[PDB]
């Protein structure tokens, strides 16, 4: 899904009497904050200007776009929306301050609802502030500043009051036009680590396979699968994990993909495999995906069950934050006849504005997502 930002440049000069206007104007694309793109506006399209085949998405989320101007000799500058005016103002400008936050969309939640920022002149500060927020896309424009402090130019710059924790600051002055406070925060990582414990004689029967799958879960949805093998004495470790996602703690689980004969229990990241002729397990993990219930509508457990060959065998379990919305059957014949049965999951509690899909291509991986409508 991409975009279009469009706008124009007007001129507030009595039509240039004073025949001072240049000739173009540079405006700058910031996307949340950070330039990416450039252009120049001129008479040549009626100082119209547009920016197109723009991503509407970074990292799944709206990214919000402004526009800024690189100074203009003598002109003061007010941007409304795509809108920019430069008035004519002789010996006088404005200088604009923009807040780019690099802390990946704020995922460890640790982004303040403000910051305030101070306009120096030449080294001294001026006494003109500025608070940056939400409200005002982080942007703020002074006007009515000097160019010339006696027979000299000024050189004006930006400086963060606010002590931002966990961040780091760096501060881009080199256009009094588009002068851009740039704060970095590295989000925490964490790692998942376990064994795989085979019950079976020491492999007696030597029925024992070659290798396993683990699965990794965040909150209930598969990110990563790992085939463990004897090379690592049945050790795994998912590395470099994010540790929250929208200010929340990710709760990691694993499963494994079915191995045959074998009935596994799960405790904790400690996978156990049983040797148990003809019969195996099941394991049910349910997804919500509704961005973390922002919106407070996820029921607080749901009931579902297990059906064998398309009927309803009869046993059910209750998922809810105590089990880790995860439950695991034992006891299943892996066959009937002379066929393999086909095992799948059903969802028996409805809930209301939420729309259900089951993923039953591996019993040992069931994973029941109800989206957030």
């Known amino acids: 899904e991409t975009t279009s930002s469009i706008g124009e440049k007007v001129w507030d000069d009595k039509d240039n009497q004073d025949g001072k206007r240049p000739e173009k104007v540079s405006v700058n694309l910031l996307a949340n904050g950070e330039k990416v793109k450039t252009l120049d506006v001129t008479s040549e399209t009626n100082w119209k200007y547009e920016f197109k085949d723009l991503p509407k998405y970074d990292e799944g989320k709206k990214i919000e776009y402004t526009v800024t101007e690189d100074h203009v000799k003598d002109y003061t500058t007010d941007i409304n929306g795509t809108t920019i005016t430069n008035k004519y103002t002789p010996g006088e400008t404005s200088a604009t301050v923009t807040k780019n936050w690099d802390d990946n969309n704020n995922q460890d939640g640790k982004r303040p609802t403000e910051i305030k920022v101070e306009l120096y002149q030449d080294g001294k500060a001026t006494g003109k502030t500025a608070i940056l927020n939400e409200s005002n896309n982080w942007t703020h424009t002074w006007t009515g500043l000097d160019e010339k402090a006696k027979g000299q130019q000024v050189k004006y710059t930006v400086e963060e009051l606010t002590k931002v924790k966990g961040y780091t600051t760096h501060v881009d002055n080199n256009d009094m036009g588009n002068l851009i406070t740039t ?161 799948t999951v059903e969802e028996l509690t409805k809930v209301k504005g939420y729309t259900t899909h089951v993923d039953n291509n591996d019993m040992g991986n069931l994973i029941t997502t109800n989206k957030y409508t």
């Open 183 to 343: 704060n970095k925060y590295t989000p925490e990582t964490t790692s998942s680590i376990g064994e795989k414990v085979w019950d079976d004689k020491d492999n007696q029967d030597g029925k024992r396979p070659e290798k396993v799958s683990v699965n990794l879960l965040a909150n209930g949805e598969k990110v990563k699968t790992l085939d463990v093998t004897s090379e690592t004495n049945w050790k795994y470790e998912f590395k470099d994990l994010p540790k929250y996602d929208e200010g929340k703690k990710i709760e990691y689980t694993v499963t494994e993909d079915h191995v045959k004969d074998y009935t596994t229990d799960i405790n904790g990241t400690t996978i156990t495999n049983k040797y148990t002729p003809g019969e195996t397990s099941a394991t049910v993990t349910k997804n919500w995906d509704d961005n973390n219930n922002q919106d407070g509508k996820r029921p607080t457990e749901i009931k579902v069950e297990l059906y064998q060959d398309g009927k309803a065998t009869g046993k059910t379990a209750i998922l809810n934050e105590s089990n880790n919305w995860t439950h695991t059957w034992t006891g299943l014949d892996e066959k009937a006849k002379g066929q393999q049965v086909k095992y």
